[PDB]
Amino acid sequence: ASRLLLNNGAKMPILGLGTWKSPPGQVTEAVKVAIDVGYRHIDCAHVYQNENEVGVAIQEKLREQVVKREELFIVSKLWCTYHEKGLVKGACQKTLSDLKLDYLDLYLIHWPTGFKPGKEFFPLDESGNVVPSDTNILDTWAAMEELVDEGLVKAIGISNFNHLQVEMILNKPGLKYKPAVNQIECHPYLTQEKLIQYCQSKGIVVTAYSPLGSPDRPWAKPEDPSLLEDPRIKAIAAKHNKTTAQVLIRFPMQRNLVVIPKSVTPERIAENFKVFDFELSSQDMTTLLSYNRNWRVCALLSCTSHKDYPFHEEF
Ligand SMILES: NC(=O)c1ccc[n+]([C@@H]2O[C@H](COP(=O)([O-])OP(=O)(O)OC[C@H]3O[C@@H](n4cnc5c(N)ncnc54)[C@H](OP(=O)(O)O)[C@@H]3O)[C@@H](O)[C@H]2O)c1
Ligand SMILES: O=C(O)Cn1c(=O)n(Cc2ccc(Br)cc2F)c(=O)c2ccc(Cl)cc21
């Protein structure tokens, strides 16, 4: 297909519209044009602060007529603030409320990373770091096995999230459910060859976030790296009379992956979905993998002393 095989027998589309960065002012149009175009998969979250407006679009595309609930794939996540098994529960409730649906297709633990509950989405040190939470990897996994049992969510998994932390959850006693998917970032400057064959190896599904390198990331500086604007990628894209975003987007798909591109911009929603027409050669595939600088983009660093920090091993 256009559509990978979940452990829960279900069928996830290869391509979806990301929704991180997308103001409440741009996100209903973005989603309704993605639907008229053809994306049936979307990636939301409660942090994005836009879910409610993602929803109404879905809602009027449904009730207008273009799509059926069945044929959707909505994905969302658990904030760091309700790793509390007692609180996992409400977290899926007001998101499903937000969304205006009665179920969700795949639910994520947003981070390996527990922080202390209150209003603030990121409670800070008094000096540098996040105020963590005593909460627990596999004991939070359970609070959402519970969510499947109760009907709320058809399937379940992890965001980003290393070999260690994965390999814990399937060694958990009493293990009722398997993670479906491991949402990680990937792109040409981290290819992550080796948790290619752990994640997936042995045997869960990978969704590549930030496929374009994310150049509207709040910590937006560098001076330097620039996947959209890179000389040697530009030429791949020229060869296929396609664009670089296209080449970028095709790239995870072709490694057995799932891609969530974001844009709010109707032009490039409709454009970003235009990627089934070409196959990258064996050489672009070799090359765009030779580009691996090990270079993280989501990265956050007032959380770095926290025990469950994804990015402290190599895979
Ligand atoms: N679990 C996680 O921690 C996590 C973290 C990061 C990302 N994700 C998810 O994955 C999705 C994708 O990542 P992203 O938001 O990080 O970054 P991204 O999709 O790689 O990059 C977003 C930016 O690329 C620009 N763009 C997109 N298509 C383009 C095109 N054809 N030509 C030129 N520019 C284009 C967009 O412009 P405009 O949008 O300004 O038009 C936008 O600001 C997110 O929306 C999010 O839901 C998950
Ligand atoms: O979480 C997301 O999907 C997107 N996203 C993100 O990626 N990080 C980085 C980050 C946060 C916490 C930890 Br722990 C590690 C990290 F590196 C953010 O700070 C972030 C901030 C606000 C919102 Cl609305 C989304 C964000």
Angstrom distance (rounded) from CA 156 to CA 174: 16
In this structure, the number of other CB atoms found within 10 A of the CB of residue 93 comes to 12
- Indicate if 198 belongs to the active site: no
Ligand 2 midpoint to CA 48 (Å): 9
Q: For the chain, give the longest Cα–Cα distance.
A: 54
Task: Please identify, by atom number, the ligand 2 atom nearest to the C-alpha of residue 49.
Answer: 24
Identify the bridge partners of residue 12 per DSSP, sorted by sequence position.
Answer: 4
> Three-state DSSP class for 46?
coil
Write the single-letter amino acid at 120. E
- Structure-block tokens of residue 53: 């407006």
Residues 6+ apart with CB under 8 A from 259: 14, 15, 16, 207, 208, 211, 249, 252, 253
Angstrom distance (rounded) from CA 207 to CA 187: 11
Burial of 148 (0-12, 13-18, 19+ CB in 10 A): middle
Contacts 24+ apart (CB under 8 A), 193-198: 193/289, 193/292, 194/314, 194/315, 195/162, 195/163, 195/315, 196/255, 198/163, 198/166, 198/167, 198/315
Q: How many domains in the chain?
A: 1
Annotated ligand binding at 164? The verdict is no
Q: Which ligand is nearest to the CA of 261?
A: 1
CA distances from 117 to 58, 66, 79, 86, 108 (A): 30, 40, 10, 11, 18
Angstrom distance (rounded) from CA 208 to CA 278: 20
Residue nearest to atom 16 of ligand 2 (CA): 300
- Structure-block tokens of residue 67: 């799509």
Q: Which ligand is nearest to the CA of 19?
A: 1
The C-alpha R_g of the chain, in whole angstroms, comes to 19
Which helix (H) or strand (E) is 53 found in, with range? Answer: helix 51-64
Angstrom distance (rounded) from CA 257 to CA 83: 27
Angstrom distance (rounded) from CA 281 to CA 288: 11
User: Is the CB of residue 81 below 6 angstroms from any atom belonging to ligand 2?
Assistant: no
CA distances from 67 to 57, 63, 75, 236 (A): 11, 8, 17, 35
Angstrom distance (rounded) from CA 73 to CA 205: 15
Residue with tokens 């904030």: 79
In this structure, the number of other CB atoms found within 10 A of the CB of residue 173 comes to 5
Angstrom distance (rounded) from CA 304 to CA 269: 35
Angstrom distance (rounded) from CA 208 to CA 210: 7
Residue whose CB lies within 8 A of the most ligand 1 atoms, among 113, 184, 214, for a mutation test:
214
In this structure, the number of other CB atoms found within 10 A of the CB of residue 11 comes to 14
- Structure-block tokens of residue 133: 């939470």
User: Is the CB of residue 152 below 6 angstroms from any atom belonging to ligand 2?
Assistant: no
Write the single-letter amino acid at 299. A
- Structure-block tokens of residue 230: 């890179």
Annotated ligand binding at 261? The verdict is yes
Q: Which ligand is nearest to the CA of 54?
A: 1
* Runs of H (alpha helix) within 174-306: 193-196, 231-239, 244-253, 266-272, 282-290
In this structure, the number of other CB atoms found within 10 A of the CB of residue 119 comes to 6
Quick one: three-class SS letters along 121-186? CCCECCCCCECECCCCCCCCCCCCCHHHHCCCECCEEEECCCHHHHHHHCCCCCCCCCCCEEEEEC
Q: Which domain holds residue 211?
A: 1-315
Q: Which of 61, 65, 48 is CA-nearest to residue 108?
A: 48
User: Is the CB of residue 303 below 6 angstroms from any atom belonging to ligand 2?
Assistant: yes
The resolution, in angstroms to one decimal, equals 2.5
Residues 6+ apart with CB under 8 A from 265: 30
Residues 6+ apart with CB under 8 A from 308: 111, 112, 113, 114, 137, 165
- Structure-block tokens of residue 3: 């559509």
Angstrom distance (rounded) from CA 161 to CA 163: 7
Residues 6+ apart with CB under 8 A from 22: 30, 48, 50, 262, 264
Residues 6+ apart with CB under 8 A from 64: none
Q: Which residues of 53-89 are buried (b: 16+ CB within 10 A; e: fewer)?
A: bbbebbbebbeeeebeeeebbbbbbbbbbbbbbebbb
Task: Please identify, by atom number, the ligand 2 atom nearest to the C-alpha of residue 113.
Answer: 14
Residue 201 belongs to domain with CATH number: 3.20.20.100
Identify the bridge partners of residue 202 per DSSP, sorted by sequence position.
Answer: none
Which helix (H) or strand (E) is 27 found in, with range? Answer: helix 27-37
Q: Which of 61, 96, 62 is CA-nearest to residue 77?
A: 96
CA distances from 225 to 57, 184, 220, 294 (A): 34, 20, 11, 12
Q: Which of 104, 105, 102, 81 is CA-nearest to residue 91?
A: 81
Sign of CA dihedral 191, 193, 195, 201: positive
Contact 72, 58 (CB under 8 A): yes
Write the single-letter amino acid at 182. N
Query: For strand 73-78 and strand 106-109, is the pairing parallel, antiparallel, or unpaired?
Result: parallel
